[PDB]
Coordinates of C-alpha atoms and ligand atoms in Angstrom, one line a residue:
Chain A
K1 CA -30.5 4.5 -1.9
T2 CA -27.8 3.2 -4.2
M3 CA -24.1 2.3 -3.4
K4 CA -21.4 0.9 -5.7
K5 CA -19.2 -2.1 -4.4
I6 CA -16.2 -2.2 -6.8
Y7 CA -14.2 -5.2 -5.6
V8 CA -10.7 -4.8 -7.1
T9 CA -8.3 -7.7 -7.4
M10 CA -4.7 -7.0 -8.2
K11 CA -2.0 -9.3 -9.5
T12 CA 1.7 -8.1 -9.5
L13 CA 3.5 -8.2 -12.8
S14 CA 6.9 -6.7 -11.7
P15 CA 8.2 -6.5 -8.1
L16 CA 6.2 -4.3 -5.7
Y17 CA 7.4 -2.0 -3.0
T18 CA 5.4 0.2 -0.6
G19 CA 7.4 1.5 2.3
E20 CA 6.7 0.6 5.9
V21 CA 5.1 3.5 7.8
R22 CA 4.9 2.3 11.5
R23 CA 8.0 3.7 13.1
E24 CA 8.3 0.8 15.6
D25 CA 7.9 -1.9 12.9
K26 CA 10.3 0.0 10.7
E27 CA 13.0 0.3 13.4
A28 CA 12.5 -3.3 14.3
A29 CA 13.5 -4.0 10.7
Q30 CA 16.2 -1.4 10.1
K31 CA 18.7 -3.9 11.6
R32 CA 18.2 -6.2 8.6
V33 CA 16.3 -4.3 5.8
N34 CA 16.7 -0.7 4.9
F35 CA 13.4 -0.5 3.1
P36 CA 10.8 -2.7 4.8
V37 CA 7.5 -3.4 3.0
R38 CA 4.3 -2.1 4.6
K39 CA 2.8 -5.0 6.6
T40 CA -0.1 -5.7 8.8
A41 CA 0.2 -7.3 12.2
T42 CA -1.6 -10.3 10.6
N43 CA 1.6 -10.5 8.5
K44 CA -0.2 -9.4 5.3
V45 CA 1.0 -6.7 3.0
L46 CA -1.2 -3.6 2.7
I47 CA -0.8 -0.9 -0.1
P48 CA -2.3 2.6 0.0
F49 CA -4.9 2.8 -2.8
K50 CA -7.0 6.0 -2.4
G51 CA -4.1 8.4 -3.2
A52 CA -3.1 6.4 -6.3
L53 CA -6.7 6.4 -7.7
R54 CA -7.1 10.1 -6.9
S55 CA -3.7 11.1 -8.4
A56 CA -4.4 9.1 -11.6
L57 CA -7.8 10.6 -12.1
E58 CA -6.5 14.1 -11.2
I59 CA -3.7 13.9 -13.8
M60 CA -5.9 12.3 -16.5
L61 CA -8.9 14.6 -16.0
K62 CA -6.6 17.6 -16.0
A63 CA -5.0 16.6 -19.2
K64 CA -8.4 15.9 -20.8
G65 CA -9.3 19.6 -19.9
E66 CA -11.7 19.3 -17.0
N67 CA -11.0 21.5 -14.1
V68 CA -9.8 19.2 -11.2
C69 CA -7.9 20.1 -8.0
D70 CA -4.4 19.0 -8.2
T71 CA -3.7 17.9 -4.6
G72 CA -0.2 16.5 -5.2
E73 CA 1.3 19.8 -4.1
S74 CA 1.3 21.3 -0.6
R75 CA -2.0 23.1 -1.1
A76 CA -3.6 21.6 2.0
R77 CA -7.0 22.4 0.5
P78 CA -9.0 21.1 -2.5
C79 CA -12.2 22.8 -3.7
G80 CA -15.7 21.3 -3.5
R81 CA -16.8 21.2 -7.1
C82 CA -14.0 19.1 -8.6
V83 CA -14.6 15.8 -10.5
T84 CA -12.3 14.0 -8.1
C85 CA -13.3 16.1 -5.1
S86 CA -16.8 14.7 -5.4
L87 CA -15.4 11.2 -5.7
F88 CA -12.2 11.1 -3.6
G89 CA -13.4 13.8 -1.2
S90 CA -12.9 17.4 -0.3
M91 CA -11.8 19.3 2.8
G92 CA -15.4 20.1 3.8
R93 CA -17.4 17.2 2.4
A94 CA -16.6 13.4 2.6
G95 CA -15.8 11.2 -0.3
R96 CA -18.4 9.3 -2.3
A97 CA -15.7 6.6 -2.7
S98 CA -14.2 4.9 0.3
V99 CA -11.2 3.2 -1.1
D100 CA -9.7 0.4 1.1
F101 CA -6.2 -0.7 1.6
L102 CA -5.0 -3.3 -1.0
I103 CA -4.4 -6.0 1.6
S104 CA -2.9 -9.2 0.3
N105 CA -4.3 -12.7 0.1
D106 CA -1.1 -14.5 1.2
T107 CA 1.0 -13.7 4.2
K108 CA 4.6 -12.5 4.3
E109 CA 7.3 -15.2 4.0
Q110 CA 5.2 -16.1 1.0
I111 CA 5.1 -12.8 -0.9
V112 CA 7.8 -10.5 0.6
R113 CA 11.4 -11.3 -0.2
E114 CA 14.5 -9.4 1.0
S115 CA 16.5 -8.0 -1.9
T116 CA 19.8 -6.3 -2.9
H117 CA 20.0 -2.9 -4.6
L118 CA 23.2 -1.2 -5.6
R119 CA 24.9 2.0 -6.5
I120 CA 27.6 1.5 -9.1
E121 CA 30.5 4.0 -9.5
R122 CA 30.3 5.0 -13.2
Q123 CA 34.0 4.9 -13.8
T124 CA 35.1 2.0 -11.6
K125 CA 32.0 0.0 -12.8
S126 CA 31.7 -1.5 -9.3
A127 CA 29.4 -1.2 -6.3
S128 CA 29.8 2.1 -4.3
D129 CA 27.0 1.5 -1.9
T130 CA 24.8 -1.5 -1.3
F131 CA 21.5 -1.7 0.5
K132 CA 18.7 -4.2 1.4
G133 CA 15.1 -3.7 0.7
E134 CA 12.0 -5.9 0.8
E135 CA 9.7 -6.5 -2.1
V136 CA 6.6 -8.3 -3.0
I137 CA 6.9 -11.1 -5.6
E138 CA 5.3 -11.2 -9.0
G139 CA 2.0 -13.1 -9.3
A140 CA 1.1 -12.1 -5.7
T141 CA -2.6 -11.3 -5.4
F142 CA -4.1 -8.3 -3.6
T143 CA -7.7 -7.3 -2.9
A144 CA -9.6 -4.1 -2.1
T145 CA -13.1 -2.7 -2.2
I146 CA -14.2 0.7 -3.5
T147 CA -17.5 1.8 -2.0
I148 CA -18.7 4.7 -4.1
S149 CA -22.0 5.8 -2.5
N150 CA -24.4 7.8 -4.5
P151 CA -23.2 6.5 -7.9
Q152 CA -23.0 9.1 -10.7
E153 CA -22.8 6.6 -13.6
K154 CA -19.4 7.9 -14.8
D155 CA -17.9 6.9 -11.4
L156 CA -17.2 3.3 -12.3
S157 CA -15.7 4.3 -15.7
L158 CA -13.5 6.9 -14.0
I159 CA -12.4 4.3 -11.4
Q160 CA -11.5 1.7 -14.0
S161 CA -9.5 4.2 -16.2
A162 CA -7.8 5.3 -13.0
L163 CA -6.9 1.6 -12.6
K164 CA -5.6 1.5 -16.2
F165 CA -3.4 4.5 -15.3
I166 CA -2.1 2.8 -12.2
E167 CA -1.4 -0.2 -14.5
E168 CA 0.7 2.0 -16.7
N169 CA 2.3 4.2 -14.0
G170 CA 2.4 1.8 -11.0
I171 CA 1.3 1.5 -7.4
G172 CA 3.6 1.8 -4.4
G173 CA 7.2 3.1 -4.6
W174 CA 10.3 3.0 -6.8
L175 CA 8.0 3.4 -9.8
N176 CA 10.7 4.9 -12.0
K177 CA 13.0 1.9 -11.4
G178 CA 10.5 -0.7 -12.8
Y179 CA 8.7 -1.5 -9.6
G180 CA 5.0 -1.9 -9.0
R181 CA 3.7 -2.8 -12.4
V182 CA 0.3 -4.4 -11.7
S183 CA -2.9 -5.7 -13.4
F184 CA -6.3 -5.0 -11.9
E185 CA -9.7 -6.7 -12.5
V186 CA -13.1 -5.2 -11.7
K187 CA -16.2 -7.2 -10.6
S188 CA -18.6 -4.4 -9.6
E189 CA -22.1 -4.8 -7.9
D190 CA -24.7 -2.2 -6.8
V191 CA -25.8 -3.0 -3.2
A192 CA -29.3 -1.8 -2.3
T193 CA -31.7 -2.3 0.6
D194 CA -31.3 -5.8 2.0
Chain B
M1 CA -34.5 -6.3 24.7
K2 CA -32.6 -8.4 22.0
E3 CA -28.9 -7.6 22.1
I4 CA -26.6 -8.5 19.2
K5 CA -23.4 -9.9 20.6
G6 CA -20.2 -10.7 18.7
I7 CA -16.5 -10.5 18.6
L8 CA -15.2 -8.1 15.9
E9 CA -11.7 -8.5 14.5
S10 CA -9.6 -5.6 13.2
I11 CA -8.6 -6.6 9.7
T12 CA -6.9 -3.2 9.2
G13 CA -5.6 -1.0 12.1
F14 CA -7.5 2.0 13.4
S15 CA -6.6 5.4 14.6
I16 CA -8.5 7.3 17.4
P17 CA -6.6 10.6 18.3
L18 CA -8.4 11.8 21.4
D19 CA -6.7 14.8 23.0
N20 CA -3.3 16.1 24.1
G21 CA -1.6 13.5 22.0
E22 CA -3.1 10.4 23.6
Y23 CA -5.0 7.8 21.6
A24 CA -7.6 5.1 22.3
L25 CA -6.3 1.5 22.4
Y26 CA -9.7 0.2 21.5
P27 CA -12.6 1.9 19.7
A28 CA -15.6 3.2 21.7
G29 CA -19.3 3.0 21.4
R30 CA -19.3 6.5 19.9
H31 CA -17.5 5.2 16.8
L32 CA -19.9 2.2 16.6
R33 CA -22.9 4.5 16.7
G34 CA -21.5 6.8 14.0
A35 CA -20.5 4.1 11.6
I36 CA -23.8 2.2 12.0
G37 CA -25.4 5.6 11.4
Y38 CA -23.7 6.0 8.2
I39 CA -24.5 2.4 7.1
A40 CA -28.2 2.9 7.9
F41 CA -28.5 6.4 6.2
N42 CA -26.6 5.2 3.1
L43 CA -28.9 2.2 2.9
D44 CA -31.9 4.5 3.9
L45 CA -32.8 2.2 6.8
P46 CA -35.4 4.2 8.8
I47 CA -33.7 4.0 12.2
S48 CA -31.1 6.6 10.8
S49 CA -33.5 9.4 11.9
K50 CA -33.1 8.5 15.6
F51 CA -29.3 8.0 15.3
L52 CA -29.0 11.8 14.7
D53 CA -30.3 12.5 18.2
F54 CA -27.5 11.6 20.6
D55 CA -29.7 11.9 23.7
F56 CA -31.3 8.6 22.9
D57 CA -31.1 5.0 24.1
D58 CA -33.5 2.6 22.3
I59 CA -30.3 1.0 20.9
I60 CA -27.4 1.5 23.3
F61 CA -24.1 0.9 21.4
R62 CA -21.6 -0.1 24.1
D63 CA -17.9 0.1 23.3
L64 CA -15.6 -2.3 21.5
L65 CA -13.5 -3.2 24.6
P66 CA -11.2 -6.1 23.7
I67 CA -11.7 -9.8 24.4
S68 CA -8.8 -12.0 25.3
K69 CA -7.6 -15.6 25.4
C70 CA -9.3 -15.6 28.8
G71 CA -12.6 -15.2 26.9
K72 CA -14.0 -12.5 29.2
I73 CA -13.7 -9.0 27.8
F74 CA -10.7 -6.9 29.1
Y75 CA -11.8 -4.2 31.7
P76 CA -10.6 -0.7 32.5
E77 CA -8.3 -0.5 35.5
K78 CA -8.2 2.1 38.3
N79 CA -6.6 5.2 36.7
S80 CA -4.6 3.3 34.1
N81 CA -4.1 3.2 30.4
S82 CA -4.3 -0.6 30.5
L83 CA -7.1 -3.0 30.9
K84 CA -6.1 -6.2 32.8
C85 CA -8.5 -9.1 32.1
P86 CA -10.9 -10.1 35.0
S87 CA -10.4 -13.8 34.6
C88 CA -6.6 -14.5 33.9
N89 CA -4.1 -11.6 34.3
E90 CA -3.2 -10.2 30.9
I91 CA -3.0 -6.5 30.0
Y92 CA -4.0 -4.8 26.8
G93 CA -1.7 -1.8 27.3
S94 CA -0.2 0.8 25.1
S95 CA 1.8 -1.9 23.3
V96 CA -0.8 -1.9 20.6
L97 CA -0.1 1.7 19.7
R98 CA 2.4 2.5 16.9
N99 CA 3.6 5.9 15.9
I100 CA 3.1 6.1 12.1
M101 CA 4.9 8.7 9.9
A102 CA 3.6 8.7 6.4
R103 CA 4.1 11.4 3.6
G104 CA 4.6 14.2 6.1
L105 CA 1.7 13.2 8.3
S106 CA 2.4 11.7 11.7
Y107 CA -0.4 9.9 13.5
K108 CA -0.7 6.9 15.8
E109 CA -2.6 3.6 15.2
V110 CA -3.6 0.4 17.0
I111 CA -2.3 -2.8 15.4
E112 CA -4.7 -5.1 13.7
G113 CA -5.3 -8.8 14.3
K114 CA -7.1 -8.2 17.6
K115 CA -10.5 -9.4 18.9
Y116 CA -13.0 -7.0 20.4
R117 CA -16.5 -7.2 21.8
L118 CA -19.7 -6.3 19.9
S119 CA -22.6 -5.5 22.2
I120 CA -25.6 -3.5 21.0
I121 CA -28.2 -3.7 23.7
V122 CA -31.6 -3.3 22.0
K123 CA -34.1 -2.1 24.6
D124 CA -37.2 -2.6 22.5
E125 CA -37.6 -5.3 19.7
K126 CA -39.2 -2.6 17.5
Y127 CA -35.8 -1.8 16.1
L128 CA -34.3 -5.3 16.4
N129 CA -35.4 -6.2 12.9
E130 CA -33.5 -3.2 11.5
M131 CA -30.6 -4.2 13.8
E132 CA -30.6 -7.5 11.9
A133 CA -30.1 -5.5 8.7
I134 CA -27.3 -3.4 10.0
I135 CA -25.4 -6.5 11.3
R136 CA -26.1 -8.1 7.9
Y137 CA -24.3 -5.3 6.2
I138 CA -21.5 -5.6 8.8
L139 CA -21.4 -9.4 8.3
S140 CA -20.8 -9.0 4.6
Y141 CA -19.1 -5.7 3.7
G142 CA -17.3 -4.9 7.0
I143 CA -17.5 -1.8 9.2
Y144 CA -14.9 1.0 9.3
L145 CA -14.5 2.6 12.7
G146 CA -12.2 5.5 13.4
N147 CA -10.2 8.0 11.3
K148 CA -9.4 7.8 7.6
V149 CA -12.3 5.5 6.8
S150 CA -12.3 6.7 3.1
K151 CA -8.5 5.9 3.1
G152 CA -9.1 2.3 4.4
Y153 CA -8.3 2.4 8.1
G154 CA -10.2 0.8 10.8
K155 CA -11.5 -2.3 8.9
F156 CA -13.4 -4.2 11.5
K157 CA -15.2 -7.4 10.5
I158 CA -17.6 -9.3 12.7
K159 CA -17.0 -13.0 13.2
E160 CA -20.1 -14.1 15.2
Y161 CA -23.7 -12.7 15.1
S162 CA -25.2 -14.0 18.3
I163 CA -28.6 -12.3 18.8
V164 CA -29.1 -13.0 22.5
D165 CA -31.8 -11.5 24.7
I166 CA -30.3 -9.8 27.7
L167 CA -31.5 -8.4 31.0
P168 CA -30.5 -4.9 32.3
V169 CA -28.7 -6.6 35.2
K170 CA -28.8 -3.5 37.2
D171 CA -27.7 -4.6 40.8
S172 CA -25.2 -2.5 42.7
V173 CA -22.3 0.5 38.9
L174 CA -18.8 -0.2 37.9
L175 CA -18.6 2.4 35.0
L176 CA -17.2 0.2 32.2
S177 CA -17.0 3.3 29.9
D178 CA -16.1 6.9 31.1
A179 CA -19.4 8.7 31.2
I180 CA -20.7 12.2 31.7
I181 CA -22.2 12.1 35.2
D182 CA -23.1 15.8 35.5
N183 CA -19.8 17.6 36.1
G184 CA -17.4 14.8 36.9
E185 CA -13.7 15.1 36.3
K186 CA -12.5 13.4 33.1
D187 CA -13.1 15.5 30.0
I188 CA -15.0 13.6 27.3
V189 CA -15.3 14.9 23.8
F190 CA -17.8 13.6 21.0
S191 CA -19.0 14.7 17.6
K192 CA -22.2 15.0 15.5
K193 CA -21.0 15.2 11.9
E194 CA -24.3 15.5 10.1
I195 CA -24.6 15.2 6.4
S196 CA -27.2 17.5 4.7
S197 CA -26.2 20.4 7.0
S198 CA -22.3 20.0 6.7
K199 CA -22.4 20.6 10.5
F200 CA -19.4 19.3 12.5
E201 CA -19.8 20.0 16.2
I202 CA -17.0 19.0 18.7
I203 CA -19.3 18.6 21.7
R204 CA -17.7 18.1 25.1
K205 CA -19.3 16.8 28.3
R206 CA -17.1 16.4 31.4
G207 CA -17.6 13.3 33.5
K208 CA -16.3 10.3 35.5
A209 CA -13.4 8.0 34.3
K210 CA -13.8 4.2 33.7
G211 CA -12.1 2.2 36.4
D212 CA -14.2 2.8 39.5
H213 CA -28.4 1.7 37.3
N214 CA -31.3 2.7 35.0
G215 CA -31.0 -0.4 32.9
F216 CA -27.5 -1.0 31.5
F217 CA -21.2 6.0 27.2
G218 CA -22.6 4.9 30.6
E219 CA -22.0 1.2 30.9
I220 CA -22.1 -0.8 34.1
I221 CA -20.8 -4.2 35.4
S222 CA -21.5 -6.4 38.4
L223 CA -19.5 -5.5 41.5
Chain C
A1 CA 1.7 17.3 -19.2
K2 CA -0.8 16.6 -22.0
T3 CA 1.2 14.0 -23.8
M4 CA 3.5 11.1 -22.8
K5 CA 6.3 9.7 -25.0
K6 CA 5.9 5.9 -24.8
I7 CA 9.2 4.2 -25.8
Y8 CA 8.9 0.5 -26.4
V9 CA 12.2 -1.3 -26.2
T10 CA 12.8 -4.8 -27.5
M11 CA 16.2 -6.3 -26.6
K12 CA 17.8 -9.5 -28.1
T13 CA 20.8 -11.1 -26.5
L14 CA 23.7 -11.4 -28.9
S15 CA 25.9 -13.0 -26.2
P16 CA 25.2 -14.9 -22.9
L17 CA 23.5 -12.7 -20.4
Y18 CA 23.9 -12.6 -16.7
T19 CA 22.2 -10.4 -14.1
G20 CA 22.4 -11.8 -10.6
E21 CA 19.6 -12.7 -8.3
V22 CA 18.8 -10.0 -5.8
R23 CA 16.4 -12.0 -3.7
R24 CA 18.3 -13.5 -0.7
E25 CA 15.7 -16.3 -0.3
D26 CA 15.8 -17.2 -4.0
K27 CA 19.6 -16.9 -4.1
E28 CA 20.3 -19.0 -1.0
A29 CA 17.8 -21.7 -2.2
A30 CA 19.8 -21.8 -5.4
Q31 CA 23.4 -22.1 -4.0
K32 CA 22.7 -25.8 -3.5
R33 CA 22.8 -26.3 -7.3
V34 CA 24.1 -23.1 -8.9
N35 CA 26.6 -20.7 -7.4
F36 CA 25.3 -17.7 -9.5
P37 CA 21.6 -17.8 -10.1
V38 CA 20.1 -15.2 -12.4
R39 CA 17.5 -12.6 -11.5
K40 CA 14.1 -14.3 -12.0
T41 CA 10.5 -13.5 -11.3
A42 CA 8.1 -15.7 -9.4
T43 CA 6.4 -16.0 -12.9
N44 CA 9.7 -17.7 -13.9
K45 CA 10.7 -14.9 -16.3
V46 CA 14.0 -13.1 -16.1
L47 CA 14.3 -9.5 -14.8
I48 CA 17.1 -7.2 -15.8
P49 CA 17.4 -3.8 -14.0
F50 CA 17.3 -1.2 -16.9
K51 CA 17.0 2.4 -15.5
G52 CA 20.5 2.4 -13.9
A53 CA 22.1 1.2 -17.1
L54 CA 20.4 4.1 -19.1
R55 CA 21.4 6.6 -16.4
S56 CA 25.0 5.3 -16.3
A57 CA 25.2 5.5 -20.1
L58 CA 23.9 9.0 -20.3
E59 CA 26.0 10.3 -17.4
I60 CA 29.2 8.8 -18.8
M61 CA 28.6 10.1 -22.3
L62 CA 27.3 13.5 -21.2
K63 CA 30.3 14.0 -18.9
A64 CA 32.5 13.1 -21.9
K65 CA 30.7 15.4 -24.3
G66 CA 31.3 18.4 -22.0
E67 CA 27.8 18.9 -20.7
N68 CA 27.3 19.3 -17.0
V69 CA 25.9 16.2 -15.4
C70 CA 25.9 14.9 -11.9
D71 CA 27.5 11.6 -10.9
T72 CA 24.8 9.6 -9.0
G73 CA 27.2 6.6 -8.8
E74 CA 29.7 7.6 -6.1
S75 CA 29.4 6.9 -2.4
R76 CA 27.7 9.9 -0.7
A77 CA 27.0 11.7 -4.0
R78 CA 23.7 13.5 -4.3
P79 CA 22.0 14.4 -7.6
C80 CA 21.8 18.0 -8.7
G81 CA 18.2 18.7 -10.0
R82 CA 19.6 20.9 -12.8
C83 CA 21.2 18.3 -15.1
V84 CA 19.4 16.6 -17.9
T85 CA 19.9 13.2 -16.3
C86 CA 18.4 14.7 -13.2
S87 CA 15.4 15.8 -15.2
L88 CA 15.0 12.5 -17.2
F89 CA 15.9 10.1 -14.4
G90 CA 15.5 12.2 -11.3
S91 CA 16.9 13.8 -8.2
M92 CA 16.4 13.6 -4.4
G93 CA 13.7 16.3 -4.8
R94 CA 11.9 16.2 -8.1
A95 CA 10.9 12.8 -9.4
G96 CA 12.3 11.3 -12.6
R97 CA 10.4 11.8 -15.8
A98 CA 11.2 8.5 -17.5
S99 CA 9.6 5.5 -15.7
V100 CA 11.9 2.9 -17.0
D101 CA 10.3 -0.6 -16.5
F102 CA 12.3 -3.7 -16.0
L103 CA 13.5 -5.7 -19.0
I104 CA 11.2 -8.7 -18.6
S105 CA 11.8 -11.6 -20.9
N106 CA 9.2 -12.9 -23.3
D107 CA 10.0 -16.6 -22.4
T108 CA 10.3 -18.5 -19.1
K109 CA 13.5 -19.6 -17.3
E110 CA 13.2 -23.2 -18.6
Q111 CA 13.7 -21.9 -22.2
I112 CA 16.3 -19.2 -21.8
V113 CA 18.3 -19.9 -18.7
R114 CA 20.9 -22.7 -18.6
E115 CA 23.4 -23.7 -15.9
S116 CA 26.9 -23.3 -17.2
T117 CA 30.3 -24.5 -16.0
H118 CA 32.9 -21.8 -15.3
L119 CA 36.5 -22.3 -14.5
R120 CA 39.6 -20.8 -12.9
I121 CA 42.7 -22.4 -14.6
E122 CA 46.2 -22.2 -13.0
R123 CA 48.5 -20.2 -15.2
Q124 CA 51.6 -22.4 -14.7
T125 CA 50.2 -26.0 -14.7
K126 CA 47.4 -25.2 -17.2
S127 CA 44.8 -27.0 -15.2
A128 CA 41.5 -26.0 -13.4
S129 CA 41.9 -24.7 -9.9
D130 CA 38.3 -23.7 -9.3
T131 CA 35.0 -24.7 -10.8
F132 CA 31.6 -23.0 -10.3
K133 CA 28.2 -23.0 -11.8
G134 CA 26.4 -19.9 -13.1
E135 CA 23.1 -19.4 -14.7
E136 CA 23.0 -17.5 -18.0
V137 CA 20.3 -16.3 -20.4
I138 CA 20.9 -17.7 -23.9
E139 CA 21.6 -15.8 -27.1
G140 CA 18.5 -14.9 -29.0
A141 CA 16.2 -14.3 -26.0
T142 CA 14.0 -11.3 -26.4
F143 CA 13.3 -9.0 -23.4
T144 CA 10.8 -6.1 -23.4
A145 CA 10.7 -2.9 -21.3
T146 CA 8.8 0.3 -21.6
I147 CA 10.2 3.8 -20.9
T148 CA 7.5 6.4 -20.3
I149 CA 8.6 10.0 -20.2
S150 CA 6.1 12.4 -18.7
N151 CA 6.3 16.0 -19.8
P152 CA 8.1 15.0 -23.0
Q153 CA 10.7 17.7 -23.4
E154 CA 12.1 17.1 -26.9
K155 CA 15.6 15.5 -27.2
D156 CA 14.3 12.6 -24.9
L157 CA 14.1 9.9 -27.6
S158 CA 17.6 10.9 -28.9
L159 CA 19.2 10.7 -25.5
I160 CA 17.5 7.4 -24.7
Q161 CA 18.6 5.9 -28.1
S162 CA 22.1 7.2 -27.6
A163 CA 22.1 5.5 -24.2
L164 CA 20.8 2.3 -25.8
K165 CA 23.6 2.4 -28.3
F166 CA 26.1 2.7 -25.3
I167 CA 24.4 -0.2 -23.6
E168 CA 24.6 -2.2 -26.9
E169 CA 28.3 -1.6 -27.1
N170 CA 29.1 -2.0 -23.4
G171 CA 26.5 -4.5 -22.1
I172 CA 23.7 -4.8 -19.6
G173 CA 23.8 -7.0 -16.5
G174 CA 26.9 -8.6 -15.0
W175 CA 30.2 -10.2 -16.1
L176 CA 30.4 -7.4 -18.7
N177 CA 34.2 -7.7 -19.1
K178 CA 34.1 -11.4 -20.1
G179 CA 31.9 -11.2 -23.1
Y180 CA 28.6 -11.4 -21.3
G181 CA 25.6 -9.1 -21.8
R182 CA 26.1 -8.0 -25.5
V183 CA 22.6 -7.0 -26.7
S184 CA 20.6 -5.4 -29.5
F185 CA 17.8 -2.9 -28.8
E186 CA 14.9 -2.1 -31.0
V187 CA 13.0 1.2 -30.3
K188 CA 9.4 1.8 -31.3
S189 CA 8.4 5.1 -29.7
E190 CA 5.1 7.0 -29.8
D191 CA 3.4 10.1 -28.2
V192 CA 0.1 8.9 -26.8
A193 CA -1.8 11.4 -24.6
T194 CA -2.2 11.3 -20.8
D195 CA -6.0 11.3 -21.1
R196 CA -6.0 8.1 -23.3
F197 CA -7.8 5.8 -20.9
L198 CA -10.7 8.1 -20.1
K199 CA -13.7 6.6 -21.9
Ligands
ZN1 ZN1 -6.7 -13.0 31.1
ZN2 ZN1 22.1 15.8 -12.7

């Protein structure tokens, strides 16, 4: 058969934030930070990728005119004939793409830096509330691996435009503040038998 | 009988929700089978046909019970959710489990940066050459065991491919993996999620519980 | 929706600019030399937070005009999700529509950021009582951001440009009462479609 092996390499252009999801690792950081960055137990920063790719292609392919399943609502069901539902899966059939977490190349204490964010009273022009949050520095390199099995020729082009959308829109959180502006690079390869 | 040993390392954490809320601290041979099945079928390796049939055993995929700083694999204790090492005295425990709450969802996961045992006992060298190919794909492109594989969870990567011939060391056994011995006590639940029939079957086979010999679940150890 | 208004903002400093370093590691490793380091990337370019300035400008001007806007600046003050700043910049429910990027400089720290002596002079004896070092972005540095409104409900560009006129008069960053942060923006909008990247 045929399987695609899109190796994605990200470089951060403006500070990155994806929230920490393990409750115990969160609470063991809520003494110091109030928004800890998602981190492995190997002290590496991992970002969810599949949702971002899917969302970008859903929004784009919908705006182009193609009937796609918007799964950003609380539908709790896609259909089985969507352009994305073939690629990033459906609720009865698995995904052709198996998008991996965008794990880092460097460890934390080399990419993640605590930070200060503010809320400023509009009249007093001074801080009302202050909070700490972690972030990933600019220039930090991340890697992933998309694994589209049964390629459908458009699949690579759809994945790379998705990447262009997540370069305009952003990956992670606080994306309306200026966070998570990234730059991907694609070096694809078609694995076969041995 | 040419068994491929190794120590896999979790690059990204894995999630095995079993039943009644409890999870599985280490991945099992079931998950190994399933994932190797996928890898074989997606690469059209012939052996894939036999992997559909669960009542088989020309390649027995034993579990991914963890290895320690004491070298020897951790082993299941008597009626305990912990796996004290034989040599040395360190427990694996439920300290690896972490409650994760993400975008409304709430599952549990085992932390990454651990070291587990790879042991695929190949009974007949007929399929050992294809076994080389599946461990080649694992050696390069990783293997994803558990839940949310398409989302990126369960990224195991092998660190050693030691293809060692092994004997059935039958003797007299220890039940190193809870197995369905007719109608034993512990409830064990599997699945055959076959592509090209869209058939997902939650099969259940009650049996004994690990922590108490036709060759070598259904593992055995010297006691 | 089907289109996206792509505002492209270019800002020139008409006065010294200061926005403080938020990173605790970068700040504490700078207190050896400079008491007030500026916000800098690890690519040695200067970040300025832009969204909150735009939202503060529009909330102040829109409260003044007589329109009904929420004050997302007070302690324990929630957004409304019915105001126009809650539609453009967001609420605790619905996301914002404008994804205001940071104002990233076009040069590096070594060409725009200088250490500067600042004083506190006694009023009676007319002599310095305190001295400190700050970092400041020089006058003539060009910063570039990119606002991107999804679902471009018309009046967006007018509101954003009015907020940029407010920021031009008032300032962006810190020490805005001493003469710092006086800027000049240069809008170059557009309306490129959402589907643009699809090949
Ligand atoms: Zn031990
Ligand atoms: Zn409002």
